[PDB]
Design a protein around this ligand. Structure first.
Ligand SMILES: Nc1ncnc2c1ncn2[C@@H]1O[C@H](COP(=O)(O)OP(=O)(O)OP(=O)(O)O)[C@@H](O)[C@H]1O
Ligand SMILES: Nc1ncnc2c1ncn2[C@@H]1O[C@H](COP(=O)(O)OP(=O)(O)OP(=O)(O)O)[C@@H](O)[C@H]1O
Lengths: 403, 108, 113, 48, 359, 96, 204
């Protein structure tokens, strides 16, 4: 069953790659890679990517979870093939993740690109929701994924995605990044990305940083600077933020404990109620200054809407198998709050159950883990799109084969 | 840490050595139990359980029944020469007795 | 890892209590009827109309030959070859140490219930 | 079946790694009980 | 008695480090090279016949030509030790920074089918070194001639989602020093000289934190340009390549490669880890491999990281003094362990399940 | 708010299902099977207790347990029990 | 002198009471269950290199009838469905193993008019029924209770009102629920109890 084959999970924020049957991916690296139009030259390993550079683009090839910059996408896959896997693509079958809403043209273009450029022996293009379901040991369930760009609820029933049940919201890691930008600005925080500091000294809580700036810095462009600052912001999201266990209450949030934090330059302070107010916008976007509008659905409402758009006969299965994924779901009390609100708003006629995965690898790379398990079954070795399927049927085979 | 192995498993028993030793640790049967007493006690306990379950099931089959009733226990523990001795002063609820009719009280 | 059978400890023959004499007959009888048995691995109607047919005149029951003059031959029952030996417990016959081993593990005492 | 097998394998190997860490910690503190054992043998030599 | 009889191997593209295990230094050492005719020697013989042999490294910065070169290296390894193999051969062996599934099947197939080892085990070199470091966790940098790892191992496991790597520890720095020279007539013109360019490091790498010292000394330098004995008997003094070369371990752009150095590589590595557990990666920061034997780079791994990390956590560098060999020691500590035998792979389960066994 | 009460039913069905694959056991018969186990446990532990106390000992041991099994079980019953336990203690101290 | 030499507990208990040459190999293998002849690679022992794949038995294709053009034209014709409208349903049937909760979602609503699950199910079933009807005479079990769509359209519906009931009907209904007992007790504990008391007072 398990053959030398490569599993790719290409997320909007990071890409995971590895072999079939591993517990964890062989490598994970930022999808928002660096570029200079020299043809162009690319940087992906975080050691060359965080160098302040004479020119920069920070190109980010994917739009709304789908490939748009095929050149940078090809460069990413090239670098992955010969920097971390270090194997000839013609030897190993390729299993690759895609967004459930990806269009047919993209599927066909990826198929022909894979077979012509990488000369691979076989191919299988699979949607993140089904992979996440396989990773969590179920054939049926509601897959909730709160990623960087969008938070999406996708029903999987008997191994297949229900397009009519997909619900998507822009409330996601990038929206949290914007909220962090706004909060830092309102706190007048001097956010400095790590590359700029030569040395620093300790300072008191709330006092400005005492640091020296490097003298050899070139005139870096705005996009790469934004990327680096957003990396610091997402570290802050890991470090400080926490969802309110229930509906945000200013009085309660004032009673809640602070969390101490420091920015790379040395500026440091305690964060209080604000660190709970930011994630509340994920669950109730009405109290989000600057983003007024009732069209936005929060995480719990994304879930309930997604299940409600399905047949009532399969809603019991979907609510009884809520599978939760995506990096944002690592925020403290995120799953507890989600479980509470869904317990409140799920109809009494049906059982509610959330699958109990909690690890960073689990929550984020469920799609890659799904590829790992899926590529390790005999019943799956007959589902491959072989190079012969492509040579005979052409680029369209991916539409006739696996959904 | 290491995958935890039980004490019934390492020895190779079905009766709970943990639970057996446990009744002993807080049973005041002694003052400082060692590291073989519960194993031996559980092994022999369950050995006698098997010894009897055997005779009980065999008599049950003699009655063309697939479920051991307390009768399949009275009949057994009185049918075996040493189980009867061991359980001589033990009454088995809803078991009955064995049809031992005295020879002199028969038709002549 | 472990020898992985002390948990089930099936036979544990400290109390073996051999089956013998009439029990052997039962086994023999069982085997006979099994060789006389049918698809499943009306017979009651056959026995009923046969017990209607009981009489001393020439009929089904009185048409049985009987015991043979030529005495019974031994055969192994594991491979069917001529068998110098008998199993001390159940009385079934065999021809090697290996055959006794297989018989003790699968057919001796196990199917007498 | 294979998802339960994957979960069991991951759990088992994490536990194995942790108890190898614990086992090596025990081995290192035994590699200090070595020095203590030498000192105690010297005290026993005084007593002899 | 497979811990008592344990064997340990590590190819060491700069110098192999192998032997009958249980003591704190390798018994078998050789330059890990394969020589062939131009138009099969591996032990301090190819290094002399370099002028009449085509020499190939069996190492590819974490990949190997697993059939011919590796089997010859193992075969030679036994001759560089007690030759106990036909009596006892329980082994743990050379392994990649990141190549478990692709390596181990072929690797253990060769070792069980050719070398018929009754017991096998394999693990990442950094996880081996951790057991010389004597603690649960660390950033173990696991350097050498072929790789510049920053693997942040936690609780005995090499989390691959945070494992990063760099390419400046051996050949690269040696060539960088070679082309830093030829500027001053030191005449490191050919491979025979390259092989002692990697030994100039025995003396010249600086005694302390040096990114400002290299500026301060250059203007008025005296009594610091330590000499080195050339094979020609020359004792030429050493210029600002007292600092040029090792500087590139922390400014790769100074060598001409577009990356930030080991401090930043390790900082990024631990930054990809969990936010709570990285508290221990700060509390356990560790160095290994011959390239870490320089004095000043320890002060770099203190200050260059302190400048980046927050003030609350501190930088507990516990680099062992013999960090050239902490892999060897740690692996030995793992192999020569009284109650470890339950974790060997052996010939019955290999036969019942194949080289695709869980290892 | 539960009031859970322990019993030996789970291991008497493992042993029974293993030593009679086709035969079940009624709930009322499993009650007897439980009481029997508790009774013999009491007997053997009490005799080992007395054994240890007679030799001025604060610890009931498996050696005392074996001698109590020799005292309790009749001749054969004893022999089998002693052999079973004795072999279970050498399979447990050999780290299997 | 005491022989011992073994474990303390076991010793006291006992005395006190007196070459593999089977090379695995990386191997090509073809799956006979596939029609494309695709060669995959596998980790097999040396002693089985060349045997057929053991996962090709797990290929039981779900059965779905295949009407022909003539057959469809004669009997399967339906004023509300066109051939282009009907072949698609069976293709989705096969590619999704005759399951109709996942056939629906992928229905081509661009060239095709919107259909519920029940209509698609009934359509495919009438098609199967008439396909077997073309046979019929060859003992083709003309007793098929093809999925009821009418009652079932309802049965789907009259669950939906009970699905989304924020309170009252989910909450307040408890009251009427209790009333089911009251209405089933106090009326007979009323009109019947009265009649019994009238007779009791009549005799009294
Ligand atoms: N430890 C953490 N704690 C809290 N939030 C986190 C953590 N790590 C990442 N995040 C948030 O998760 C976002 C990234 O999520 P993730 O890695 O699951 O996305 P992705 O795989 O790229 O998504 P998609 O597959 O939907 O395109 C980051 O932008 C950050 O907002
Ligand atoms: N005595 C020494 N003093 C200082 N630095 C040294 C010394 N010996 C070697 N080095 C440095 O370390 C490198 C070799 O280190 P080491 O022997 O640990 O690596 P290796 O095992 O050969 O490599 P790899 O693990 O990549 O196969 C040499 O290239 C040089 O950079």
């Amino acid at each position: 069953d398990e053959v030398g084959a490569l599993v790719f999970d290409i997320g909007s924020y990071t890409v995971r790659a590895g072999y079939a049957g591993e517990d964890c991916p062989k490598v994970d690296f930022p999808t928002a890679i660096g570029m200079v139009v020299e043809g162009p030259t690319y940087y992906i390993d975080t050691n060359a990517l965080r160098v302040p550079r004479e020119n920069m683009e920070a190109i980010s090839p994917l739009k709304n979870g789908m490939v748009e910059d095929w050149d940078s996408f090809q460069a990413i896959l090239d670098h992955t093939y010969k920097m971390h896997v270090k194997s000839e693509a013609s030897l190993h079958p390729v299993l690759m993740s895609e967004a459930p809403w990806n269009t047919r043209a993209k599927r066909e273009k990826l198929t022909e690109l894979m077979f012509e450029h990488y000369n691979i022996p076989a191919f299988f293009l699979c949607k993140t929701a089904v992979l996440t379901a396989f990773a969590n040991g179920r054939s049926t369930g509601l897959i909730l994924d709160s990623g960087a760009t969008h938070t999406t609820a996708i029903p999987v029933h008997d191994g297949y995605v229900l397009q009519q049940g997909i619900v998507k919201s822009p409330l996601a890691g990038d929206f949290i990044t914007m909220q962090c930008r706004e909060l830092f600005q309102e706190m007048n925080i001097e956010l400095v990305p790590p590359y700029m500091i030569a040395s620093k000294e300790a300072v008191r809580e709330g006092s400005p940083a005492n640091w020296k700036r490097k003298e050899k810095l070139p005139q870096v462009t705005r996009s790469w600077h934004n990327y680096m600052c957003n990396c610091v912001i997402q570290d802050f999201q890991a470090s400080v933020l926490q969802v309110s266990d229930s509906t945000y209450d200013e009085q309660v949030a004032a009673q809640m404990p602070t969390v101490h934090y420091e920015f790379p330059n040395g500026y440091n302070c305690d964060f209080g109620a604000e660190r709970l107010k930011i994630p509340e916008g994920l669950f109730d976007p009405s109290n989000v200054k600057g983003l007024s509008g009732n069209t936005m659905l929060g995480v719990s409402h994304v879930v309930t809407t997604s299940v409600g758009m399905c047949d009532i006969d399969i809603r019991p299965g979907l609510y009884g198998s809520v599978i939760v994924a995506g990096g944002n779901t690592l925020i403290q009390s995120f799953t507890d709050r989600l479980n509470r609100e869904l317990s409140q708003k799920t109809p009494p006629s049906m059982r509610l159950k959330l699958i109990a995965n909690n690890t960073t690898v689990e929550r984020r790379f469920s799609s890659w883990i799904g590829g790992s398990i899926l590529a390790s079954l005999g019943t799956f070795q007959q589902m491959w799109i072989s190079k012969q399927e492509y040579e005979e049927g052409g680029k369209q085979c991916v539409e006739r084969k696996c959904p | 840490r290491a995958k935890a192995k039980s004490r019934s498993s390492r020895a190779g028993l079905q009766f709970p050595v943990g639970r057996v030793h446990r009744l002993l640790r807080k049973g005041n049967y002694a003052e400082r139990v060692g590291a073989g007493a519960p194993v031996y006690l559980a092994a022999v306990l369950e050995y006698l359980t098997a010894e009897i379950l055997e005779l009980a099931g065999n008599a049950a089959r003699d009655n063309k029944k697939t479920r051991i009733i307390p009768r399949h226990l009275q009949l057994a523990i009185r049918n075996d020469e040493e189980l009867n001795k061991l359980l001589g002063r033990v009454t088995i609820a809803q078991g009955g007795v064995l049809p031992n009719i005295q020879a002199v009280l028969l038709p002549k | 890892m472990v020898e992985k059978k002390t948990s089930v400890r099936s036979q544990d023959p400290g109390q073996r209590r051999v089956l013998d004499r009439a029990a052997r007959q039962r086994r023999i009888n069982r085997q006979l009827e099994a060789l006389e048995n049918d698809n499943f691995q009306n017979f009651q109607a056959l026995l009923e109309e046969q017990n209607l047919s009981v009489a001393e005149g020439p009929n089904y029951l009185t048409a049985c030959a009987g015991p043979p003059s030529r005495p019974q031959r031994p055969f192994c029952a594991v491979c069917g070859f001529p068998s110098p030996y008998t199993c001390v417990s159940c009385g079934a016959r065999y021809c090697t140490v290996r055959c006794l081993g297989t018989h003790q593990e699968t057919r001796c005492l196990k199917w007498t219930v | 079946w294979l998802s339960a097998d994957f979960a069991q394998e991951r759990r088992w190997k994490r536990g194995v790694a942790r108890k190898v860490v614990r086992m090596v910690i025990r081995h290192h503190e035994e590699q200090r009980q070595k020095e203590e054992r030498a000192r105690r043998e010297e005290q026993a030599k005084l007593r002899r | 008695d497979d811990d008592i009889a344990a064997l340990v191997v590590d190819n060491g593209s700069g110098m192999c480090k192998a032997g009958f295990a249980g003591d704190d230094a390798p018994r078998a050492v050789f330059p890990s090279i394969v020589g062939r005719p131009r138009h099969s020697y591996v032990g301090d013989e190819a290094q002399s016949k370099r002028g009449i042999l085509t020499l190939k490294y069996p190492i590819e910065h974490g990949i190997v030509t697993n059939w011919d070169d590796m089997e010859k290296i193992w075969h030679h390894t036994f001759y560089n030790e007690l030759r106990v193999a036909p009596e006892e051969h329980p082994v743990l062996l050379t392994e990649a920074p990141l190549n478990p599934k692709a390596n181990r099947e072929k690797m253990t197939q060769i070792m069980f089918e050719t070398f018929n080892t009754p017991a096998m085990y394999v693990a990442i070199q950094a996880v081996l070194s951790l057991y010389a470091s004597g603690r649960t966790t660390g950033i173990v940098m696991d350097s050498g001639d072929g790789v510049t790892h920053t693997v942040p191992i936690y609780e005995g496991y090499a989390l691959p989602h945070a494992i990063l790597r760099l390419d400046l520890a051996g050949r690269d720095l040696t060539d960088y020093l070679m082309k830093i020279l030829t500027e001053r007539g030191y005449s490191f013109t050919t491979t025979a000289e390259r092989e002692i360019v990697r030994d100039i490091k025995e003396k010249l790498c600086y005694v302390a934190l040096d990114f400002e010292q290299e500026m301060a000394t250059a203007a008025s330098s005296s009594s610091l340009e330590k000499s080195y004995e050339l094979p020609d008997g020359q004792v030429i003094t050493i210029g600002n390549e007292r600092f040029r070369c090792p500087e590139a371990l922390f400014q790769p752009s100074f060598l001409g490669m577009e990356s930030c150095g080991i401090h930043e590589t390790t900082f990024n590595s631990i930054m990809k880890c969990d936010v709570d557990i990285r508290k221990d990666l700060y509390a356990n920061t560790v160095l290994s491999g011959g390239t870490t034997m320089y004095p000043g780079i320890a002060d770099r791994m203190q200050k260059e990281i302190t400048a980046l990390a927050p003030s609350t956590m501190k930088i507990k560098i516990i680099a062992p003094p013999e960090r050239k060999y902490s892999v060897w020691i740690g692996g030995s500590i793992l192999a020569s362990l009284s109650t470890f035998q339950q974790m060997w792979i052996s010939k019955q389960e290999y036969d019942e399940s194949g080289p695709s066994i869980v290892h | 708010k539960r009031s859970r009460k322990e019993s030996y039913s789970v291991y008497v069905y493992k042993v029974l299902k293993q030593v009679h694959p086709d035969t079940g056991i009624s709930s009322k018969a499993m009650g007897i099977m439980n009481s029997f186990v508790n009774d013999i446990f009491e007997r053997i532990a009490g005799e080992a207790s007395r054994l240890a106390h007679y030799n001025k000992r604060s610890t009931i041991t498996s050696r005392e347990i074996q001698t109590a099994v020799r005292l309790l079980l009749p001749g054969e019953l004893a022999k089998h029990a002693v052999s079973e336990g004795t072999k279970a203690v050498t399979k447990y101290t050999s780290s299997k | 002198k005491r022989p011992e030499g073994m474990h303390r507990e076991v010793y006291a208990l006992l005395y006190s009471d007196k070459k593999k040459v089977r090379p695995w190999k990386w191997m090509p293998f073809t799956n006979p269950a596939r029609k494309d002849g695709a060669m995959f690679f596998h980790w097999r022992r040396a002693a089985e290199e060349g045997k057929d794949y053991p996962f090709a038995r797990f290929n039981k294709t779900v059965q779905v009838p295949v009407y022909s053009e003539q057959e469809y034209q004669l009997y399967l014709h339906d004023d509300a469905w066109t051939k282009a409208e009907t072949d698609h349903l069976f293709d989705l049937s096969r590619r999704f193993d005759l399951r109709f909760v996942v056939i629906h979602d992928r229905y081509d609503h661009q060239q095709f008019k919107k259909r519920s699950v029940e209509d698609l199910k009934e359509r495919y079933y009438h098609i199967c029924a008439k396909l077997a009807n073309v046979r019929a005479v060859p003992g083709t079990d003309l007793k098929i209770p093809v999925f009821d769509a009418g009652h079932e359209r309802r049965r789907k519906e009259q669950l939906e009102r009970l699905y989304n009931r924020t309170p009252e009907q989910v909450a307040e209904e408890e009251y009427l629920l209790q009333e089911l007992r009251k209405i089933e007790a106090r009326k007979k504990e009323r009109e019947k109890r009265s009649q019994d008391l009238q007779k009791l007072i009549t005799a009294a």
